[PDB]
Amino acid sequence: GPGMPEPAKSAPAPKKGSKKAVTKAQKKDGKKRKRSRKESYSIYVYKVLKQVHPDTGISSKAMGIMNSFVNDIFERIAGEASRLAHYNKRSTITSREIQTAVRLLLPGELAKHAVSEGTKAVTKYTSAK
Amino acid sequence: GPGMSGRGKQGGKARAKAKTRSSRAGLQFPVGRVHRLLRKGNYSERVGAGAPVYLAAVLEYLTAEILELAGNAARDNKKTRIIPRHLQLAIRNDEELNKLLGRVTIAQGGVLPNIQAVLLPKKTESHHKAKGK
């Protein structure tokens, strides 16, 4: 009856979105008309340069050398991750074996940057598109 | 007055093009290609989805100290851009950059700045005056 108090209701549950139709994905493999530069270490060359030294640019030569410098240790990291997978009796490299492979090659503060703060930085890569 | 009539013959029309997708075109991001670069490298049988992401974080730091010291060398030499001569200096003059580039150097047995005591060889007993006749 109307003399009784109305009980406290929860906030209304949001309506579920309709099933969006999955369209025909256009072929972006082997494309000739792109603005993306050939995917290489150049990504971070400009990023960390502008972050630390906003007043200072870089040459195409110096960029190419920094890419080579990273590749020479990246090859070793891949080799160590492969070695770890072999000792762990795996056919595949894990998302953890790569961290250890880097740590083994990078003594002292180099692992604190590349591995410890590297693992903290994963949150940025998952949150941002 | 009256308009001109169309030809009585049928067909000969241009065929209608297929309708384009309703879904909007996304931007190209690089980490999905880094996954394929790891596969092309053939490091193992399958590449985990997190592997190129975690390696991208590693890669950023792998030249961060190179960029820092090369940019310091550029500022010191009053240059507008980093050039190969700044890398020749920065690499050779810093042992952590010698570790980042190529062959990893041994961390222990590194030279300390404070003068260490010279470890003298164990001296033999000095020849005392021999007893004469």
Curated annotation (Swiss-Prot), chain A:
Which residues in this protein are found as N6-crotonyllysine?
K9, K15, K16, K19, K20, K24, K27, K38
* Residues recorded with modification N6-(2-hydroxyisobutyryl)lysine: K9, K16, K24, K27, K28, K38, K47, K50, K61, K89, K112, K120, K124
Query: N6,N6,N6-trimethyllysine-modified residues are where?
Result: K89
Tell me the compartments it is located in: Nucleus; Chromosome
Q: Where is this region: Disordered?
A: 4-38
* Residue positions where N6-glutaryllysine is found in the record: K20, K38, K47, K50, K112, K120, K124
**Residue positions where ADP-ribosylserine is found in the record:** S10
Q: Where is the Glycyl lysine isopeptide (Lys-Gly) (interchain with G-Cter in SUMO2) crosslink found in the sequence?
A: K9, K24
ADP-ribosyl glutamic acid modification sites are E6
Q: Which residues carry this modification: N6,N6-dimethyllysine?
A: K61
Q: Does the keyword Nucleus apply?
A: yes
Q: Which GO terms describe its molecular function?
A: DNA binding; lipopolysaccharide binding; protein heterodimerization activity; structural constituent of chromatin
List every position bearing N6-(beta-hydroxybutyryl)lysine: K9, K15, K20, K24, K38, K89, K120, K124
Residues recorded with modification Phosphothreonine: T119
N6-methyllysine-modified residues are K50, K112
Glycosylation site positions = S116
Q: What does this protein do?
A: Core component of nucleosome. Nucleosomes wrap and compact DNA into chromatin, limiting DNA accessibility to the cellular machineries which require DNA as a template. Histones thereby play a central role in transcription regulation, DNA repair, DNA replication and chromosomal stability. DNA accessibility is regulated via a complex set of post-translational modifications of histones, also called histone code, and nucleosome remodeling.
What name is this protein filed under? Answer: Histone H2B type 1-J
From Swiss-Prot, chain B:
Q: What is the effect of changing S5A?
A: Blocks the inhibition of transcription by RPS6KA5/MSK1
The record describes its post-translational modification as:
Deiminated on Arg-7 in granulocytes upon calcium entry. Monoubiquitination of Lys-123 (H2AK119Ub) by RING1, TRIM37 and RNF2/RING2 complex gives a specific tag for epigenetic transcriptional repression and participates in X chromosome inactivation of female mammals. It is involved in the initiation of both imprinted and random X inactivation. Ubiquitinated H2A is enriched in inactive X chromosome chromatin. Ubiquitination of H2A functions downstream of methylation of 'Lys-27' of histone H3 (H3K27me). H2AK119Ub by RNF2/RING2 can also be induced by ultraviolet and may be involved in DNA repair.
Q: Which UniProt keywords apply?
A: Acetylation, Chromosome, Citrullination, DNA-binding, Hydroxylation, Isopeptide bond, Methylation, Nucleosome core, Nucleus, Phosphoprotein, Ubl conjugation
InterPro entries xrefs = Histone-fold, Histone_H2A, Histone_H2A/H2B/H3, Histone_H2A_C, Histone_H2A_CS
This one is known as Histone H2A type 1-B/E
Give the matching SMART domains. H2A
What GO annotations for molecular function exist for this entry?
DNA binding; protein heterodimerization activity; structural constituent of chromatin
- List where Basic residues composition bias occurs: 10-22
Briefly, what is this protein's role?
Core component of nucleosome. Nucleosomes wrap and compact DNA into chromatin, limiting DNA accessibility to the cellular machineries which require DNA as a template. Histones thereby play a central role in transcription regulation, DNA repair, DNA replication and chromosomal stability. DNA accessibility is regulated via a complex set of post-translational modifications of histones, also called histone code, and nucleosome remodeling.
List of residues that carry N-acetylserine? S5
Question: Which PROSITE patterns does the record cross-reference, listed alphabetically?
Answer: HISTONE_H2A (PS00046)
This protein's GO cellular component annotations are: CENP-A containing nucleosome; extracellular exosome; nucleosome; nucleus
Species of origin reads Homo sapiens (Human)
Q: Write down which residues bear the modification named N6-lactoyllysine.
A: K13
Residues recorded with modification N6-acetyllysine: K9
Region feature (Disordered): 4-25
Carrying N5-methylglutamine, the residues are Q108
Indicate where the modification N6-crotonyllysine is found in the sequence.
K40, K122, K123, K129
Q: How does it assemble?
A: The nucleosome is a histone octamer containing two molecules each of H2A, H2B, H3 and H4 assembled in one H3-H4 heterotetramer and two H2A-H2B heterodimers. The octamer wraps approximately 147 bp of DNA.
N6-(2-hydroxyisobutyryl)lysine occurs at which residues?
Answer: K9, K13, K40, K78, K79, K99, K122
Locate the N6-succinyllysine modifications and list their residues: K13, K99
Q: Indicate yes or no for the key word Acetylation.
A: yes
Q: Which residues carry this modification: N6-glutaryllysine?
A: K99, K122, K123, K129
Location of the Glycyl lysine isopeptide (Lys-Gly) (interchain with G-Cter in ubiquitin) covalent cross-link?
Answer: K17, K19, K123
Top-rank taxon, per record: Eukaryota
* The keyword Transmembrane helix is annotated on this UniProt entry: no
List residues, modification N6-(beta-hydroxybutyryl)lysine: K13, K17, K40, K99, K122
